[PDB]
Amino acid sequence: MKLYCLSGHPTLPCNVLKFKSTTIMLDCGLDMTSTLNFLPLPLVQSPRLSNLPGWSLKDGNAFLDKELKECSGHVFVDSVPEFCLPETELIDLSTVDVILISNYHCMMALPYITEHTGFTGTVYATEPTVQIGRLLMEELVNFIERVPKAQSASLWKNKDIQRLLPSPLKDAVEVSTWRRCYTMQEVNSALSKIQLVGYSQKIELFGAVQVTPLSSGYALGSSNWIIQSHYEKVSYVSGSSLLTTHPQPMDQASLKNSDVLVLTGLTQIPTANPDGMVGEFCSNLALTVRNGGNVLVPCYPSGVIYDLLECLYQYIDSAGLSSVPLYFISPVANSSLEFSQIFKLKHYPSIHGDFSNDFRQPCVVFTGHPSLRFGDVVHFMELWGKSSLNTVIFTEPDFSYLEALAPYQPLAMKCIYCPIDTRLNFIQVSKLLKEVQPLHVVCPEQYTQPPPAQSHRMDLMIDCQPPAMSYRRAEVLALPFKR
C-alpha cells in the first residue's frame, strides 16, 4: 500500500492511493492561487494598468523591462494567468485506473489530467457534483477566453533568474509546471467520461476493491468516499461539514472500523466563527448600502453563495432593506439557480447586453471569480476603486486576500475580510476523531504543526493518537500496514 501525495495544497487536495491491483486517484484538484502573481485580465483596455512603470532589473543584463511590471511596491508577471497544477512526474498518469471525486471545488483539474496525457480510466462522481463542476469549469473557460491575452513571458521562468526576484515571486513553487487554462472542447469531452453514482450505491472494481460514497453535508451531492476490500478499509473524508445545512447530513457512523482516514480539507480560518462572520458580512453590506455607496462581493457562482444569499434573505426581512436590488452576474447564472432550486435576486448572463438597463445605484453585485484577476469583478474593481464610499467584502478563504487586493493599489475603497467557512474546525475534528476512532490519520503538513501566522496557539493542531503522519508536496508515503 502506498500514498503518492501530489498536491501539497492543504484544502485543494489530490492524492494517488496506490493499492494491491488498482491505483485510485482520490480527488485530483487544481491549486489556483498561482493566478495571484499575475496581472489581471480586464475586459476593456485599463488605462491604469497598461501604463504601469515597467519594472527594471538593477543590472539589466536582460530586457525584463517588458515582462515584469511594478505597482505600489509589488512586481508582477505580465501574461495570461498560468494556473497551478498537480505535479505530473512521480507516477505516470496512465497507470491510474479510477478517479473518484468529492465535490466541485476540487474537480477543476480533470481536463489537465484525463485529456492531455493519455488517461484510460473512468471517473465516478455523484450527480450534483458533476453538474456544479460542469458549471464552474464553464465559467472558467468563458472568463479566461473572452479577451485572450496570449502574449506570454518566459525569461523570468528560469531558476537562476527566479532567485533574484524578491517576494512574492520568489515565494513561487515549482514554477516550471505552470500552464495556461484548458479549452472548451477539452472539458466537454472530459466530462463525458463521468459515470454517475448515487449514495450507498456499492460499486465494484476488478473483483478486487469496492467503492461507495456517502453524503457529507458540505454541498449538494458532496461526498465522503469509502474504498474498502476483503482485508483493508480506507475512509476518504475530504471537506465535510457538520453544521446542518441544506445537504443531507453526513453519516459520521459508517466511517468506523476504518484503517486509514486521509483527512483533508479542513478550515483555513481556524480562529473565525462562521455565524459571526456572516453577521459581519450582513453588517458591512448594510453599513455601506444605507449611506449611498455600492458593494462588490466576490464569490464563486455556486457553493457558499447559496448559504450567503439565504442568510441575506433572512436579513432583508429583519432589517427592512426592501429598496436595494441584489444581482448575480456570471455566465452560468441560470443553470446555477436552476440546480440550486430543483435539487429579489435578479441573475444575469453577462455585464454586456441586458444588464446595462437595470443599473440603479446603490446596488449589490456578486460576481465572477474571487481571485480579483479575471471575470467581471476586475471591471468594477476598476470602476469603484476611487470612491471612498464603496466597499468590497471578501467571502472566500481560498486566495489570501492581501496580495489578491494588492495589484489595484493605491485604492481608497474599504476592504472588509469576513470569510465564511462551513468546514470542520479543529475542536469538531477532535471530537469527530474520538468518535469515529480511526486507527491512523494522514493530514498535510499545514495541520500537524500550528499555523504560521499564530505560532503561539497550540490548540488548532489536529490532536490524535497515534501521532498523525503527515505528507509534503509531491511525496510518497507508506501507510505502515502489513497484510
Binding site: 483596455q45 477566453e145 446595462s356 443599473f359
Partner: protein, 712 residues
C-alpha cells in the same frame, strides 16, 4: 559526475530496505537517465542485477521503464535490444500486472523487425490473460509493432475475433483497431463463414464484423468502429449497399442503426464514413443519397454542418431529384448563419437536372436574401457558379426572369442579372435576348463587379507574358503597372499574378526613383510575402533581396549581422543571385486574400447605446477568402478617436470553416473606456499579423456609432 552519484545511490538502494525510499531512488535514476551525451549503457548490466533479485512490484515496473527509455535512445545497437528482449521474456511471466504492462511495452517498442524467438506469438498468447488491462496493453503493443513497419501474420485476426464478445470497453476498441489493420494487411484472403458453406473474402468478413460491432452497448467502441469503417475501400460494393437496407432490421443495416443512434458523435462518425466510401464509389453514393438528404432534419446543428460539407464533397457523384432539391433548399430558412453559409457553398456545385429546379433554387435563394440581408455577398458568389454550370436548364428562364425596369439597387435584381450573365457567357445566344437596359445593367456590374459577372463574347495570358518580358525606364514601368492593374480588373481569374507583378513593379519603380519610400518598399514586400498564397523559394529569394536593398538604402552595424543571416539561410540561392545588390521575378500559379467586414454595417443611423461607464458588446461577423491558416495571422484592431489601439487576438474556435478557401470569423469585441460625454464614432478593422512582429491593414475599416445614456 553522473556515474559517481549513481553508484552512490545504488549502494544506498542496496543498504536501504524501505521500498518507498527505494522507489524514490529508482525515480531519481530514471530522471537522471536522460542525460543526452552520457553513457548509461554502462549501467544496464547493473539495472539487470537489480531486477534479478526484486521482491516488490513497482520497482521493476519503473526500472524496465528506464530500460525502455534508454533502448529508445539507441535503437541501432541491436545487441542491447536483444539483451533487453531476453531479460524481458525472462520477466514476462511475472504475476503482477504493472510489470507485465512494462515488459509488453518494451517488446512492442523494441521488437525484432526481421522475420530469434517469435515475439509476435509470445505477445499474442496474452490475449487470454486474466486481467483485461494486460490484454489491452498487449493489443497496444501489437499496434506499436505493426506501425514500426513489420508486416504481421494472418492468424492474429482469427485470434482477435474472439475478443469481440468480451464484456470490457477499451479491449473491444483495440480489437476493432487490430481487425482493421490486419485486414488492411490481408484483405483478399478467402475465409469461409462457419455458419454455412459459403466462402467470402477476408475483407468482407472484417467489414461485417465491424458493422455488427457497431451494435455494441458501449459508445466509445461505436465511435471507434464508425470512424474506422471510413477508409475501408477494397470491400465489395454489394455488401456496402446491403449495409443501408433499413428493411432488414448486424453485419448489414449498420449505417441506418448509426445515423439514428442516441449519441450524435457516432452519427457524425458514420457521416464521415459515408462521405469517404461515397467519394470512392459513386453508385453507393447515389444509393445512400436518400439517408444523406434525410440527415438535414437532425435536431442538432453540428451533424447538419458536417453532413452538408460531406454531401457537397460528392457533387458529381450524385444526382438530385425534385423532392431532394426541395428538402435541401427548405433548410435556408434556418436561423444559424453558419448553416446558411454552408448551404450557400453547397449550392455552388449541385447537379440539377430540371429547369424548374433552377427556377426554384433562384426563388429560394432570393427568399433567403429577403429574410437575411447580410448574407448578400455570399449569395452572389454562389450564383456566379450557378449560371456557370447548367446553361441548358436556365436557358428558358431568361425571358421570364427578365420579366418595368427595376432599379440598380435591388440585390435580387442584381443577383438574377449575374446569374443570367453567367448563363450567357457559356452560350452566346442569350445576349440577343438581353435588352438594351439589360446591357446597361451588365456594363454597370461589369465595370463595378467584374469579380462576379464574367466577360461575355487565352490572349490575356500571353498579353501578361509579353508585358512581363517588356520590363526586362520609369515610363515603361508606369505603363506596365497600369496595364497589369487594368487586366487584373478585366480578368479576376488572373488578377492574382496581376496584382503580384503590379506591386513588384511598384517596388521596383519606387526603389529606382530613390525616406518614406523605403518604408513603402518594405510594406509592399511585406504584403507580397505574407498576404499572398502560393509563393515558391524563388519568390522568397527575390523578396528577401528587395528587403536587403530596402535596409541598405534606409541606412543612408546590424546590417552585417543581417546579411550574414541572409547568407546562412540562403546558401542555395547564391549561384542564382548573380550580379545582385534588376532580378527576375517568375510569376507562379495565385490568389490575393482579402477581408469583407459585413456585420454590422455601421451605416445605420441607429447607434449602439451604453451607460455611464460599463462594457458594451460588438458582434463582428466577417468572411475571409483564400487566407493561409487565419487562426494565427489575423487580429481585430479597435481605434478610439483619442489615439490608443486595442489589438484583440481572436480565439481559435471563433473562426468557422464553411468551405474551401473561405473562412468565417464571428467574434465579440468589448467597447468601452473612461467616462464618455457625447455620442461618437469608433473604428474597428482587421489586421494581418506576421512574425519574420508586424501588422498589415488589409480590410476597409468600419466606423460604429456609440451613444451614451447615464444609468438610472
Amino acid at each position: 559526475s553522473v556515474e559517481g552519484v549513481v553508484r552512490i545511490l545504488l549502494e544506498h538502494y542496496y543498504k536501504e530496505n524501505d521500498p518507498s525510499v527505494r522507489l524514490k531512488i529508482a525515480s531519481l535514476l530514471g530522471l537522471l537517465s536522460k542525460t543526452a551525451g552520457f553513457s548509461p549503457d554502462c549501467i544496464m548490466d547493473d539495472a539487470i542485477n537489480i531486477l534479478q533479485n526484486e521482491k516488490s512490484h513497482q520497482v521493476l515496473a519503473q526500472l524496465l521503464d528506464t530500460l525502455l527509455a534508454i533502448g529508445t535512445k539507441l535503437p541501432e545497437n541491436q545487441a542491447i535490444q536483444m539483451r533487453l528482449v531476453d531479460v524481458a521474456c525472462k520477466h514476462l511471466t511475472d504475476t503482477s500486472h504493472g510489470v507485465r504492462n512494462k515488459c509488453l511495452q518494451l517488446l512492442g517498442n523494441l521488437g525484432s523487425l526481421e522475420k530469434a524467438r517469435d515475439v509476435q506469438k509470445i505477445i499474442g498468447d496474452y490475449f487470454s490473460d486474466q486481467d483485461p488491462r494486460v490484454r489491452t496493453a498487449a493489443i497496444k503493443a501489437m499496434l506499436q509493432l505493426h506501425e514500426r513497419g513489420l508486416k504481421l501474420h494472418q492468424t492474429i485476426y482469427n485470434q482477435a475475433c474472439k475478443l469481440l464478445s468480451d464484456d470490457y470497453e477499451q479491449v473491444r476498441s483495440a480489437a476493432v483497431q487490430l481487425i482493421w489493420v490486419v485486414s488492411q494487411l490481408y484483405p483478399e484472403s478467402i475465409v469461409p463463414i462457419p455458419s454455412s458453406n459459403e466462402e467470402i473474402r477476408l475483407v468482407d468478413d472484417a467489414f461485417g464484423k465491424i458493422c455488427h460491432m457497431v451494435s455494441d452497448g458501449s459508445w466509445v467502441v461505436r465511435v471507434q468502429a464508425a470512424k474506422l469503417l471510413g477508409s475501408m475501400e477494397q470491400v465489395s460494393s454489394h455488401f456496402l449497399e446491403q449495409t443501408l437496407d433499413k428493411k432488414l432490421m448486424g453485419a448489414c443495416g449498420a449505417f441506418v442503426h448509426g445515423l439514428e443512434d442516441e449519441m450524435y458523435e457516432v452519427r457524425i462518425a458514420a457521416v464521415e464514413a459515408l462521405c469517404m466510401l461515397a467519394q470512392s464509389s459513386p453508385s453507393f453514393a447515389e444509393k445512400c443519397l436518400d439517408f444523406l438528404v434525410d440527415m438535414f432534419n437532425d435536431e442538432i446543428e453540428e451533424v447538419r454542418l458536417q453532413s452538408i460539407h460531406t454531401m457537397r464533397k460528392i457533387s458529381n457523384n450524385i444526382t438530385l431529384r425534385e423532392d431532394q432539391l426541395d428538402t435541401v433548399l427548405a433548410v435556408l430558412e434556418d436561423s444559424s448563419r453558419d448553416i446558411r453559409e454552408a448551404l450557400h457553398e453547397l449550392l455552388c456545385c449541385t447537379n440539377v437536372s430540371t429547369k424548374e429546379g433552377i427556377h426554384l433554387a433562384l426563388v429560394e435563394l432570393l427568399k433567403n436574401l429577403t429574410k437575411y440581408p447580410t448574407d448578400r455577398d455570399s449569395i452572389w458568389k454562389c450564383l456566379k457558379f450557378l449560371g456557370s454550370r447548367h446553361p441548358t436548364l436556365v436557358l428558358p428562364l431568361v425571358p421570364e426572369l427578365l420579366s418595368a425596369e427595376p432599379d440598380m439597387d435591388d440585390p435580387a435584381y442584381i443577383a438574377v442579372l449575374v446569374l443570367i450573365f453567367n448563363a450567357a457567357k457559356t452560350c452566346p445566344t442569350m445576349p440577343a435576348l438581353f435588352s438594351d437596359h439589360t446591357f446597361r445593367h451588365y456594363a454597370y456590374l461589369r465595370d463595378s463587379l467584374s469579380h462576379l459577372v464574367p466577360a461575355l463574347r487565352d490572349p490575356s495570358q500571353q498579353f501578361l507574358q509579353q508585358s512581363l518580358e517588356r520590363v526586362y525606364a520609369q515610363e515603361l514601368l508606369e505603363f506596365t503597372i497600369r496595364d497589369l492593374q487594368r487586366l487584373g480588373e478585366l480578368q479576376s481569374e488572373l488578377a492574382g499574378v496581376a496584382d503580384f507583378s503590379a506591386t513588384y513593379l511598384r517596388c521596383q519603380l519606387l526603389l529606382i526613383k530613390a525616406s518614406a519610400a523605403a518604408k513603402q518598399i518594405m510594406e509592399e514586400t511585406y504584403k507580397m510575402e505574407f498576404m499572398y498564397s502560393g509563393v515558391e523559394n524563388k519568390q522568397v529569394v527575390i523578396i528577401h533581396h528587395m528587403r536587403l536593398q530596402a535596409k541598405a538604402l534606409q541606412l543612408i552595424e546590424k546590417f552585417l549581422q543581417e546579411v550574414d543571416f541572409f547568407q546562412r539561410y540562403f546558401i542555395a540561392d547564391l549561384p542564382h543571385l548573380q550580379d545582385s545588390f534588376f532580378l527576375h521575378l517568375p510569376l507562379p500559379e495565385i490568389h490575393k486574400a482579402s477581408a469583407t467586414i459585413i456585420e454590422p454595417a455601421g451605416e445605420s443611423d441607429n447607434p449602439l447605446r451604453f451607460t455611464s461607464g460599463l462594457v458594451v458588446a460588438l458582434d463582428v461577423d466577417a468572411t475571409l477568402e483564400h487566407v493561409q491558416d487565419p487562426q494565427n495571422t489575423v487580429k481585430v484592431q479597435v481605434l478610439y478617436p483619442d489615439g490608443q489601439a486595442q489589438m484583440i487576438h481572436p480565439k481559435p474556435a471563433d473562426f468557422r470553416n464553411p468551405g474551401p478557401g473561405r473562412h468565417r470569423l464571428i467574434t465579440q469585441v468589448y467597447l468601452s473606456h473612461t467616462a464618455w460625454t457625447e455620442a461618437c464614432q469608433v473604428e474597428v478593422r482587421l489586421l494581418l499579423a506576421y512574425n519574420s512582429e508586424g501588422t498589415i491593414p488589409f480590410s476597409k475599416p468600419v466606423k460604429v456609432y456609440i451613444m451614451p445614456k447615464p444609468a438610472r
